[PDB]
Amino acid sequence: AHRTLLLRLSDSGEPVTSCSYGQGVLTLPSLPLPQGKKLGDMPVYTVKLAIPAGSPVTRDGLIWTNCPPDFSTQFDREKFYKKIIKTSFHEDDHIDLDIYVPGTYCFYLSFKNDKDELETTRKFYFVVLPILSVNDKFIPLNSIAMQSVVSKWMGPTIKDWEKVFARVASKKYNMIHFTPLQHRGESNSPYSIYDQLEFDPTVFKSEKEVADMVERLRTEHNILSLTDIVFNHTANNSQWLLDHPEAGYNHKTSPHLISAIELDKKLLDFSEQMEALGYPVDLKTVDDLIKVMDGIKEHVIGELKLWEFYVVDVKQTVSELREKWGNSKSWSDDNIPSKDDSTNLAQFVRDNATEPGFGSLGERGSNKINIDKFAAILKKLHSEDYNNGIEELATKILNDINLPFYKEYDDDINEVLEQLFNRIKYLRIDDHGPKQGPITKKLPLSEPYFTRFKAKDGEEYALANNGAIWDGNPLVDFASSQSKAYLRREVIVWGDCVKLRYGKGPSDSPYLWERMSKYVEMNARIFNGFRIDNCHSTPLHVGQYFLDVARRVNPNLYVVAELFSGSEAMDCLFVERLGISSLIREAMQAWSEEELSRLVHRHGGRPIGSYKFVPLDDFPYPADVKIDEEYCAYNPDDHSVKCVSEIMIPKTLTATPPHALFMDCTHDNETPNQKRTVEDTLPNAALVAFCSSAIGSVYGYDEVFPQLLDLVQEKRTYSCAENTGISKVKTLLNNMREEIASEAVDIEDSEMHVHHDGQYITFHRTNAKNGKGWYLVARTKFHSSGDQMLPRIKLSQTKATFKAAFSLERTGDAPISDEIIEGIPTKLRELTGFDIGFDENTKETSILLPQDFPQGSIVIFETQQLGIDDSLDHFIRSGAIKATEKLSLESINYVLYRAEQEEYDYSEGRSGAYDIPDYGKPVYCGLQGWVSILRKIIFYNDLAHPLSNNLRNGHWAVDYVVNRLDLYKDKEGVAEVQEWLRSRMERIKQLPSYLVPSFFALVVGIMYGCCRLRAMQLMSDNVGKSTVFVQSLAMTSIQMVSAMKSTSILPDQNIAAMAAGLPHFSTNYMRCWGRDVFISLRGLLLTTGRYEEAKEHILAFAKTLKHGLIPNLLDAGRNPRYNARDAAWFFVQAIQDYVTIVPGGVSLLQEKVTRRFPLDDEYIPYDDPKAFSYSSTIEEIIYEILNRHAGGIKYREANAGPNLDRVMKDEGFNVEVNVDWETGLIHGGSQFNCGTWMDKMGESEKANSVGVPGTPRDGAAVEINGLLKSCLRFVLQLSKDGKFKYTEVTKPDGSKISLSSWNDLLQENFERCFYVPKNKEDDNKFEIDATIINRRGIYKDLYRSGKPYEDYQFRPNFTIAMVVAPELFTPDYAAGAIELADQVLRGPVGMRTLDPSDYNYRPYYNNGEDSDDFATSKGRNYHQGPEWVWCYGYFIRAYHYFNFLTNPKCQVEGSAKKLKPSSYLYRKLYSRLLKHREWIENSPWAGLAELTNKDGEVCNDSSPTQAWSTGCLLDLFYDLWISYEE
Amino acid sequence: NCPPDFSTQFDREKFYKKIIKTSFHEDDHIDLDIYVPGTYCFYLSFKNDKDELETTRKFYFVVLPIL
C-alpha cells in the first residue's frame, strides 16, 4: 500500500531532525511484509528525499546512493548510482529511494561549488531492520527474548542439547544465542576457535547436522537462533596458522613488536630458570615483592642492551664517519643552527640527516642517522679535516639527539615493571583473585604476550594474542604501530587466542579475508543472526565487509553487538555503517539502586503524556496532494506506515536511538548471588522485562546458579532440574510481552514512568494508543538493608487490577556436585494483601503494599487510563478536512490569525488572546498563535513549559480555542470548523489531565495543517506548489485581508480590507493605507490568485479620488486625508498589474463606481446627496489623475487645523504638484509636508521638531516619476489595442500635449536629470553641481528638492523606477548603480533608507525618546538609516533584471532559444533571501517585519508583520515564474 | 521561427515547439506551414547520450516573394 517515509534535507544536504530523540540513527521501523508478499515482490520501504528549492546543492546536483535499483541487483558498498536533482527556484524536488532488502544504505550529494568546482557532502547512512519470523508469525524486534547458552555445558549429544531447548521453551523465550559451536582450541575456551569452518566434532559432523538442529528449534519450539562470530582472534594452535602465518601480526608484518617479542621470550626464559636463584619464587611478603622486582631490574632489563631500539648507536656512528670521510662532503644554506643553541642543532640533524623511520620502533638498530648528510654538515659547521674536534663534536650532537629518546626509555621501563608488580600482586597475593600457584610451564609469572611456533616455510614465527587495555580508546589497535601497549606490558592478554591481522583490505592478508568470508557465510546459511563480542575493537571496514557478505546470504540477518566505544556518537556511527540492529545493555552493571533505575529509565520509553509530532508551519502543503478524506485508506493486512493525519504527508524519517537488547545477566558478569544476593534475581529481571526493548538472560540466571561459570576450565553440565527459581515468572513476563507486541509500534506509541525510593523501583509501562498499561513494584535486594516501607501509590484517572505477585526466598546453599551445575534451592511464594482503592469521585486509584513484602519481591498490576479506548486516535485524526471544506481565504484569517486588537474589534474589547500564566499571550488569537509556540515545545517534548503546565492544570485553553469562533461563527465554513474543534476538544477533556497537553497540540496541529492546505488549494498554482518559504510568504495575505467592525474599505459596508500591518495598523483609521495597499496588491492578491479581492480594493479606493490623488489614509469613505503624492501612482500601477495578470483584466477599466466626491476638488460630507451623485469609470479615473497632474493641481487640505494634524504647520497643509514640461517630471511638495512613503513628522518639543518633517521629499521623486512613465506606456498600448479612449492632456495655461509626447519627454529627460555620472568628465550633461555630491554612479533620489544635499543621497527609492520603468535606464548605468546599492544600502533583511556614509545617518529608530537630538527624539530617524523590508523587494527585483541584461555570466541557453538566467545568478538571488527565510521561520508572527535597526538589529517599535514587506518578495518569485517556468 | 498562422507576425528569435513521434520502425513527418515569404530556419533539440541537452545547427530555407 503506502510504505513511504519522508527524509527532508537541509540546504547543505544533511538530514533534518523532525524531533529531538537524542543521539541516534536513521532507522526504519521493523514491520512485516504485506499479506502474502516475499522479498522482491515490492519495495520494503521508499525513502522520499526532499531537497530545498534553490539550495546550493541543487546547482548541477546529483544524489548518489548504494541502494540497488531493483531486487535483481546485488548490494555493493562502493557502487553508487546517479540520481538527477530537478533544480527549481520555486518547487522542491522529491527523489524516491526504493529499498527491496534490509541492510545498510548511505547517500551523499555532489554539486557545483561556488568556485565552479566539484564538492561532495558527507555520507549519510540509514538502516533497514531485518524481518524476523519464526514459522509465519511476525516477531517485533522489541519483543525478543534471548536465552544465551554455552555449548560445552549442554551435554555431549544433540538430543541432550534438545533437553535444554525444551526447558527454555517453557520459559517462553523466542530466541537462543549460541556461544560459537565450532571446534575449540587448546584451552577449550568457546572463543578460542581451532578451525572456523568446522563445527564441534564431538556433537556435529556436518553443516547439515547443525542446520537441521536449528531448523528443528524453529518448527518445534518456535525459537530463532544466532551465534557469536569472532573476528578479532583465533586459537593459538590452528594448523592454518602454521600454513599461513601472515594472518597475524608477526616480525615481518608488524616489525614494531620485535622489541616486545624479545622481552616476552626474555621472561618465559627467566621464569623457567627463576627458581635457581629465586629468592621469592612464590611468597606473599612485602620483602618478597621487591626482590622479584630487583630480579626483573637486573636479570632481564640489564641484559637487554640498554635498548638501542630508541638510542642512536653513538660510537658506531663515529666509526661510520671516518670510514668514508671524503665522499659527499658539502652543505649550503645557512639554516644550520649555531653550536651555541645545542637543542636546535641537535634536532636539525633529526629533520634533515636521518634514515627512514627515525623515532619509530622496528629492528634493534632501527633509528639511524644518514651519514653522508651528517658529515656534509660537520664539514660546513666546523672543519673539513676529521681530527679537528669532530670526534668530540659528532658525539656531543648524537648524545643530545638521544636525550629525548633516553627520557622516552625511562618513562617506558617504569611502566613496564610498575605494570608487572601491580599485576603479579593481584594475581598472586590474593586481593580479590586467589591464584598463588607455583610457577609452572602452564602458569609462569609471565603471561605469554606472544604465541611462539614453528611453521612450514622454515622460519620460526612469533604471533601475539589480543586482549584489552584497561583504559584507552578501543578504536586504537593495540597491535598496530600506533600503540606501545605490548612493549610497556599494558595488555591483559588471552593466551587461548591469537592475533588476526586484517589490513586495509584483502590485499594485506589474502587468505584471512577468504577464510573469514567462508566462515561468515557458513553460519549465515543456518542461523538467523550474529553476535559480536567487543565490536568496538573490530575495525569498521573489517566489520562492514563481512556483515555485508552475511546479509547477501541471509537478507534478514539480526545483528547484536556489545558496543562500548568512546561515546554515544561513535556508538551510533558503528550502528549506522555496520547495520547493527541491537546493542547489548547489561543490568548487572548497576552498582546501586539508583543506577539501576537510571539504566531502566534509559531503555523504558518516553515520558507519559509525550507530545506527538505533527506537520506545522514548517512543511510544504501542495494543493495537489492525495488525502485520506476520513483517515480510512488503511488496511491492517497491508502493514503500511501511517501518515500523521488526513493529509498524506508521509511519516518523517528521523534519527532514533539504536535499539537495545537489555540483558539482566550476560555470560561474562557475576551472578546476583555474587554481586548482590540471590533474591534480587526476581526484581531485577522484572524491571528489565518491563522495558520497551528486547530482553535477554544467560542460562543459570533464572536457575539461580551460585557463581559465574568459568568459560575456560569448567566441564560440568547444566542441570535438568525443571522449573527452578524464576522459570515460572519468566514464563509470565515473556507471555505478557507477546500480548503487548501485537499493537505497540513506534517510539511515540509506548510511554513510561520510573520511580526510585530507597530499595523500591517503580515501573509504569503505558501504551499511548489505547491507554492499557502495566505497573511494577519491585523491591530490590542489593544488600540486606533492613525493613523499608513504601508510601501510598497514587494513580490519577486510572483503574488498577491485580495481575500477579511473587517473592523469592533462599532455602540454604547450593549443592556441590562435580558433574552437574546445580542452582540454589529457592522458594517462589505468591503474595497477597495488595489493597487497590478507587475513588469514584476523583477517579484516583490508590495502592497500598502489604507489610509482608520482603526484599526480592515484585507485584504486577494491570492498569487502564480512563477516557481512552482504541478508537480515540481515529476520532482525532479524521473529519478535519471535511470540516474545512467550506472555508474561504477570508474565513481562514479568523481561524488561524487575528491579533488581539483585531479580536477586540469583534468582541468590543471583552475577549482578546488567552494569557498563558508565567509566559504571556500567543501572538495570534487563532491556531497560528498556538502553532508558533507549540512547534518548539513538540520538538523538545518540553512538558515543563508554562503552556504544558496550564494545559494539564485545567481545560481553559481547550475551551478557549472553541469559544473564540463564536465571534466569527456566521462566516463561511467557520461553523463546521468550530464543530470539529468542539467535538474533539470535548472528547479530550474526558482524558487524564497529564495527557491533555499532547492531545491539545495534536488537535490544534491537525486543524492548522488542514486550514493551511485549504489555503494553498484556493490559491494559484505558483504558490500552491512551491517551497515552505513561498507558501509562508503567501499566508501573509490571509493575515492582512480581513473583515472588521470599526473600519473597512467601503463607507457603507464592512467587507475585507487589507491591513497595513499587525498589530499597530489593523483597527479604525490606522488599518487601510492607499499607498501600502497597492504596493502589496500584486504580491498578496495577484501572485496568490485573489483576483476578485484585488478588484474590490481598486474599486473602493477609486471612489475616494480627489485632487487627482489617492488618499494616504482611507477611512472607508469618510474624512480620507489626502496627504499623499505617492499613493495615486502606486494605485495606477496596481491597475496595470491587475490588467496585465488577471485574465480579461481590461474589464476593470469599464467598471462603474459611485464616486463619493465631486469632480471639482471641493468638500462634500459623508451624508450628502452629492456624495453618490455621478458614476466614474476606471478609464475616467486614470485619465482624471493624468490630466489633473498635467493641468496643475491646487489645493489646501480640507478641515486643516489641530483637528487634522496635531503637529503639521499651517503652511504644511497647502502642498502642491506640477509637471515641468521640459523634462516631463512631476514635482511637488514642501519642506513642511511629508507626502511620500517616508512619512515622518517631527513631534519632539524638547528637540524642537514639532511639525518639521524628518524626510521631506519635495520635488521630483524617482518613485513618482518612474510610475508615471509606466502608466503612460500602459495607456498608450491600451489605446493601441482599443481599450483606452483619451489621448490628449492639457497643461495649466491651456495648451495640449499628446500622451505619447509626455512618454517621450520622460524617455529623453529622466535619466538626464537623475543619473550622476561616475566620471567627472561627463558631469556637464547630467544636471549635477559637483560641490554637493556624495558618490558617483548613482541615480539621484530627488530632483529640485528644497535641501540640495538630499537630492544626492543614496536611497533605495530609485529601484521602484527601475522595476516599473526599465526603459528609462541605460543598462550599464543601472547595473553599476544597483551594484552600489547592494554593497552599501542592502541590509540583511531590510533596505537601508540612507547611505551610512552620510552625516544625517542615524540607523536606530526608537519612537519614544525624549532627548534634544533632532533625529533620535520621537523617532525622526524613521527613514534615515533604518532598514525597511519592502524596499528589499523592489531592490532584488531590479537586481535580478539588470544583472540579467548586463553580466554575461548571468545568462544560459534555454529551451526554444529564450535567454534564461544562469545558476550563477540564481545562486546570488537565493543567498540574498536566506535571512528572510530565517526570519519568517523563527518569528512568532508568521511573516516579515516592517522595520529593522542597523545590521539586522530587531526594532521593538517595528510592526512584526507588514503587508508590503512580504508582498514585494512575492513579486520577485512571480517575476521568475511567469517569465522562465514554462 | 515559422509563425503558427497568418495572424501571428514573424519573429527571428521566437521559435515554436514541435513534438517528434519516436519509433524504431516508422519515420515521423512534421509539417511546417508557411503563410508569408521570408527567411525561416529550424534546429533540433534532443537528449544526448550523456543524458544532457544538445542542439543542432540552424538550417535556413527561403520562400521567394510573389511578384
Ligand SMILES: OC[C@H]1O[C@H](O[C@H]2[C@H](O)[C@@H](O)[C@@H](O[C@H]3[C@H](O)[C@@H](O)[C@@H](O[C@H]4[C@H](O)[C@@H](O)[C@@H](O[C@H]5[C@H](O)[C@@H](O)[C@@H](O)O[C@@H]5CO)O[C@@H]4CO)O[C@@H]3CO)O[C@@H]2CO)[C@H](O)[C@@H](O)[C@@H]1O
Ligand atoms: O481620527 C482623527 C485623527 O486626527 C489625528 O490624526 C493625525 C495625527 O495627529 C498626526 O500626527 C498624523 O499622524 C501621522 C504622522 O504625522 C506621520 O508622521 C506618520 O507617523 C508614523 C510614526 O511617526 C511612527 O512612529 C509610526 O507610528 C507607529 C509606531 O512606530 C509603532 O511602534 C506603534 O506605536 O504604532 C504607531 C502607529 O499607531 O508609524 C507612523 C505611520 O507611518 O503617520 C501618522 C499617521 O498618518 O496625521 C494623522 C492624520 O489623521 C489625531 O492625532 C488622531 O488621534 C485622530 O484619531
Ligand SMILES: OC[C@H]1O[C@H](O[C@H]2[C@H](O)[C@@H](O)[C@@H](O)O[C@@H]2CO)[C@H](O)[C@@H](O)[C@@H]1O
Ligand atoms: O558635502 C556635504 C554633504 O555630503 C557629505 O558627504 C561627504 C562629502 O560629499 C565629501 O565631499 C566629504 O565632505 O565627505 C563627506 C562625508 O564626511 C555629508 O555626508 C552629507 O551629509 C552632506 O550633506
